[PDB]
Amino acid sequence: DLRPVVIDGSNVAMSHGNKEVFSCRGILLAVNWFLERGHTDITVFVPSWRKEQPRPDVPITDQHILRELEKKKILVFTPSRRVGGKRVVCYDDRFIVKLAYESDGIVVSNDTYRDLQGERQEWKRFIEERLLMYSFVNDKFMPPDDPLGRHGPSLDNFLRKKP
């Protein structure tokens, strides 16, 4: 009925609260926005290292929310690990775009994934047609009523499989 929603968790969390802090409530607030509208196919991707005890160069707030959302089958960690002590992480954005693409859904993010546009040009097309940007005002998740500009569909229709 509604398109499947894929959220760039890191993008949303950095955007919420202080721009230099990974603010987990941002993710929760975005997820809740979709839940209250009756969505049930929602996936949030975050790299697994965000569960590790934070170092001072990677501050994070309400860290417990990530595992809480994972339990609820909303959030899914993408792979990362240390090798020779150095963090090595698998590109987040490939998971995000690839899932959204193959499920013909929506990507929630203010990142336009230029690099990935420049790989497969059906991705470039997909990202141009299915990216949902947003702003936060304090705790208020606010996506645009005109996702794709003035000549585009309303938000409500954007999120539907068919108007």
Side-chain angles (χ1 to χ4, degrees):
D1 180 28
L2 295 52
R3 293 204 206 279
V5 166
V6 182
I7 295 162
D8 183 328
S10 298
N11 191 84
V12 167
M14 293 310 309
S15 161
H16 175 80
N18 173 314
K19 309 298 155 161
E20 60 203 288
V21 175
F22 193 101
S23 175
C24 299
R25 290 183 60 250
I27 294 180
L28 176 56
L29 297 168
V31 161
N32 284 173
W33 186 91
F34 293 95
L35 285 181
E36 294 173 33
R37 293 170 54 100
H39 282 266
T40 60
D41 197 335
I42 309 170
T43 304
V44 179
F45 280 116
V46 173
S48 61
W49 67 267
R50 289 291 186 183
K51 286 179 303 191
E52 287 180 7
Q53 190 68 12
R55 308 242 289 146
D57 61 292
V58 290
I60 185 167
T61 55
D62 302 294
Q63 191 178 25
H64 61 279
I65 284 176
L66 303 183
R67 271 189 175 131
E68 196 190 355
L69 287 172
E70 174 192 41
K71 190 193 167 64
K72 293 186 175 174
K73 311 269 283 308
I74 294 186
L75 179 152
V76 172
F77 292 103
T78 56
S80 70
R81 65 203 268 222
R82 287 185 185 275
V83 181
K86 321 274 218 55
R87 184 123 63 209
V88 178
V89 1
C90 306
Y91 276 29
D92 223 27
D93 50 39
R94 311 195 58 85
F95 281 89
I96 292 161
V97 180
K98 213 158 183 149
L99 179 66
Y101 185 48
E102 305 180 7
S103 56
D104 200 54
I106 258 65
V107 173
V108 176
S109 182
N110 286 330
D111 186 334
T112 49
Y113 312 119
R114 299 207 87 276
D115 274 26
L116 296 180
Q117 284 189 56
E119 286 205 18
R120 295 203 195 357
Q121 275 188 334
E122 62 278 21
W123 282 351
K124 170 157 183 175
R125 280 303 173 255
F126 176 84
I127 292 172
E128 290 179 344
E129 299 176 355
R130 312 297 260 277
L131 188 72
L132 178 59
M133 305 188 77
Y134 63 90
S135 308
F136 274 107
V137 181
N138 296 325
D139 286 346
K140 202 169 191 295
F141 181 68
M142 287 188 83
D145 266 328
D146 52 345
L148 300 169
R150 198 63 184 111
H151 297 278
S154 76
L155 174 56
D156 314 82
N157 284 320
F158 187 64
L159 300 172
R160 290 178 44 87
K161 292 171 165 158
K162 279 180 169 48

